[PDB]
Homo-oligomer: 290 residues x 4
């Protein structure tokens, strides 16, 4: 009944040491919220409310302390550990029992999107019956990502993970919608070129079958880079500038839950009261005025 | 009729002294281009090629040195002066002749909009045969702006200019679309207490007649503040973050002209060659290859 | 590791909620390292190698996992829990055994100091035989801090904690050096009207005995604000700007330990390798060559 | 009896196109003041009041319109055009008459310096009776600059302009103090490999004469980059961070003039008048009350 999604929020975070020896990348602040509120908000905006969060043995417990079972926000959250970061595709192997016979979305715990009409951008993917959908976004450094190449008619024709000679500048982002076939695909994958069970290898299987849709995410959207220390500071600054100008939050899960009807006002006021001593709780309380 | 454009780029710039003793506000850089490129970009995206720039007596020559007659970008730019900052609504008096019998789109020289489907956002406004269209955006400090009050059912019911007690948090942005009725409305206005001919008074008349459309600009759009030194730095950082991430420029008049067919590839390369030694020149040239 | 110092790294983290819901404020990044590296570097630059880290019941062990016993940096680190955030002066009661009969410096865990000749600005306070030294910095908002008032000759005459009517713009910063008498003073204190055991009350005692030295940190020093989410971004951007321009790190404990001779070249190399994927480890490795 | 200095503020500006198409680079804002205020403040801080500003044929008169003869600040400003940017040493040829038989300092118009005891560092160079003083600063990308090689005992042993294989990471900044011999040295210079009259060739002759002091500007100083659009934003954010924290301005000439006694209270209040309606004028006014 509730639609399903997985947030993959593990990984070593090597590239960010020594900051991530101290704290999981997906708990770092992006301005005024931990990084994982952002991909969580994306799933909620797609209308996905049953969500499995996968992290390392050390970090899962921290996420469980941050987010709980999710009922406070009208979600159902559950959790599993990935013993080692053996690839994004292991998400479906670990989450096979959670998924059952249902479709499932996957969002990476470091993926931040923002812009106008995000839900409508996702709508076709959410309602797809058969196949898979990913989103492409023009970047200046396609060699750091999965890269999708299109023909003159705009048909996707190839996908390559971190190519030395990228065939386009379109990166495949960290949000994926699959039908139920993904689970068996993942279970038959072999560790590839970089020694990982790769999501790109799943997507390539869908592409070879003619069932991968590639939704273009235009330049009016922001897909914020979380790859380096510098870009983490840029991401924060970006959110700060939007929020302080508007006096509205970006990816505040309480607010989304409220506006989408997952929780009612009585419940928003119950969340806000114990938090009214800080700016966040004051913002939540304001919601229930009008 | 056809729709002509006015960019109002006047004002003394006192809040920014001494920076604006040296350089007009609308020439200040927002990251990599002068501030006036951004509203000049909003007009082009709306399909407007015939544009009047109104500056102060002092600033006209520098805007002309920057933009010339516009022909390099398939535009036609003209210049008129505003002797003193007597109110936005003076633009229609100053431009009465350039406007003649046509519809008008006025944009303030310091207004910066960014977001997905911005041309669509303005589509209804451009295609409106009579009346006026304005844009409302939720801000944290509505007291600094024109403010539009809505009713329980979503209808604009009052407008107030920089009110001490705002009736809502929706500011009316500095982008306005009018039919041919406005020049006469402007000509019949009397100064407010503060001694300005107010654009808010014009909009109220249209509201009063049931002829004002108020299009909501969602939280997914960015409308960047340029009122303080601090917000300028934020505006620049915000644009930089986008452009460096995408490898694409925000509000590049040459690119928009080219993508909309105002100019052709042979004209783009002609523009690029003299500039080939700098980054801006190299971005132009590449756009002619792939 | 003869000389001693305490880093007070706990607190409720209320104002930063929800970022500090699952992470201590003092483990959050300031650009490319955890916040606590900064006050630790500060103590090291003063020549202090025996350091007690006090944090909350939940966070202390997290600091201990990250830093261990400090022998890898030539330091002696030990840890104590502060059961509740009942005031800075509690550091001396908690740290009573650690201190013993010795002088001791206290630095707050969220204090970031930068500027030419800081080690000299301090090295003196370290050499004072008796009494206490504090450092005063001109700020824009003195009401948020301990405030030191000076007479016409420049002699400190008054200290007040968070005064509604500040007598000066000089804030007393979170770096303090004390002789052995501070423990007894702290044991005799009673909470203030804020409900906290106040450092300002200890400083006032010394002031009245005529044994308080107030070092002025001029306008050439930076004492970075870490109060709000916004100020964390500001602090991170400031450090990033320095480091990226100079190709040198600010407050890197491995570098300071190597430069002051706490550890040797071999040791630095061994530390660098596990970090060598990014600039942080490469920077340490090259200090060994050049 | 006024000491003499030159601000070299010419050059193409091509790299910053289109931001420099209708605006001189050195009049662009660095946070709340035009760029040229910064080196101007630097010379003032050195106690130099008789200053020659050299720029392009197009920009020199813009500087003259902004600053006048400077006696409002207790300075004596004069102007000369550099027909083309044939090298920094040409400043001493164009400035020969202005120089006469006196010592002369040279600062680049886009260099920004900040740090504790900077005035003392410069007062030393100004106190020097014979020879020259330059300042060395560790940078990430030494190949862009004049580069100074040191002895194992840290004595400066060679200088190279933009070496392909830098011998150290110490760049020679754009602030130079010379005795009167510099004019004859410049006049004998021949164009370098870059076809320029190089300041590094002058410095090398003082160094080989044993008359060059190479003062180290340590890592607690900021020497800010102004060569890219991004470096401009970084320099603005760095200044805004210091100023907003301290409530004190960096390189405000009016403030410097007042504090060094070039002008008095009455004059300060006169300068405040045209600025009195924003924070900058208020800041000036308050210095004369507190
Ligand atoms: C390998 C691995 C990763 N992760 C987490 C860590 C990160 O927060 C997040 C992304 O992992 P990364 O190692 O950065 O993979 P990454 O280089 O970011 O690339 C992935 O993400 C990209 C989009 O960001 C795509 O363009 C690539 O095709 C996709 O492979 O997933 C796990 O939770 N488990 C893992 O085993
Ligand atoms: C009054 C005046 C302003 N300007 C320029 C200067 C600024 O770049 C910009 C706005 O200047 P302001 O001093 O805010 O103008 P002001 O009359 O007080 O306010 C207007 O500008 C605001 C912009 O959104 C609106 O929200 C208000 O509804 C509108 O009335 O337009 C002109 O070019 N000519 C002018 O006469
Ligand atoms: C009260 C308290 C504080 N702390 C830690 C948390 C932060 O690292 C640091 C600062 O805590 P604060 O609650 O910000 O105390 P604060 O309002 O900043 O004021 C203190 O620090 C200021 C300088 O930052 C001084 O000017 C004040 O005189 C001094 O009282 O101390 C603890 O670890 N335990 C505590 O009980
Ligand atoms: C050559 C030249 C430059 N300028 C202005 C343009 C720039 O704003 C500023 C510095 O110009 P650049 O062309 O970046 O400077 P460049 O000759 O490459 O390097 C100089 O400046 C560097 C410091 O920035 C030093 O490390 C070098 O040793 C010194 O030669 O001086 C002039 O006004 N006149 C000139 O002839
Ligand atoms: C096409 C184009 C858009 N824009 C800006 C205007 C809007 O803010 C935003 C619109 O992007 P978007 O609507 O997402 O792209 P698309 O129409 O290609 O699907 O980008 C430019 O700045 N330059 C351009 O060349
Ligand atoms: C509805 C909502 C959206 N968002 C974010 C998701 C998208 O990035 C963006 C959508 O804005 P937008 O589509 O422009 O809003 P609207 O429907 O009001 O016109 O805002 C939140 O952070 N919180 C919310 O409650
Ligand atoms: C020596 C050193 C100093 N610092 C900091 C302390 C001060 O805030 C700033 C300047 O210290 P400073 O001692 O004056 O400069 P220098 O070492 O070049 O002589 O640098 C570090 O962050 N790391 C270090 O390795
Ligand atoms: C006194 C003063 C200094 N400065 C700058 C020059 C140096 O970069 C920095 C520090 O100067 P410095 O004299 O060392 O600090 P202070 O007088 O407070 O001890 O401040 C100004 O910009 N304006 C001023 O009025």
């Amino acid at each position: 009944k509730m639609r399903k999604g997985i947030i993959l929020a593990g990984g070593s975070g090597t590239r960010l040491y020594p900051v991530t020896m101290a704290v999981s990348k997906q708990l770092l602040p992006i301005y005024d919220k931990p990084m994982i509120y952002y991909p969580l908000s994306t799933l909620m905006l797609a209308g996905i409310r049953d969500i499995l969060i996968i992290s390392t043995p050390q970090d899962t417990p921290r996420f469980q302390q941050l987010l709980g079972d999710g009922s406070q926000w009208g979600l159902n959250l559950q959790y599993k550990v990935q013993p080692s970061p053996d690839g994004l595709a292991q998400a479906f192997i670990i989450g096979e029992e959670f998924i059952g016979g249902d479709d499932c979305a996957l969002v990476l715990g470091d993926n931040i999107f923002y812009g106008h009409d995000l839900p409508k951008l996702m709508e076709a993917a959410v309602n797809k019956e058969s196949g898979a959908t990913v989103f492409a976004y023009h970047v200046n450094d396609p060699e750091r990502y999965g890269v999708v190449e299109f023909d003159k008619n705009g048909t996707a024709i190839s996908l390559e993970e971190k190519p030395l000679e990228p065939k386009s500048n379109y990166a495949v982002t960290g949000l994926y919608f699959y039908d139920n076939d993904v689970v068996q695909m993942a279970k038959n994958l072999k560790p590839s070129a970089r020694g990982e069970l790769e999501i790109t290898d799943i997507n390539r299987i869908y592409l070879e079958q003619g069932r991968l849709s590639v939704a273009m995410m235009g330049r009016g959207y922001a897909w914020l880079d979380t790859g380096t220390h510098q870009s983490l500071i840029e991401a924060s600054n970006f959110i700060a500038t939007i929020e302080e100008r508007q006096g509205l939050k970006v990816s505040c899960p309480e607010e989304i839950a409220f506006r989408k009807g997952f929780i009612d006002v009585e419940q928003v006021r119950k969340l806000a009261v114990p938090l009214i001593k800080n700016n966040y709780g004051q913002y939540l309380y304001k919601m229930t005025k009008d």
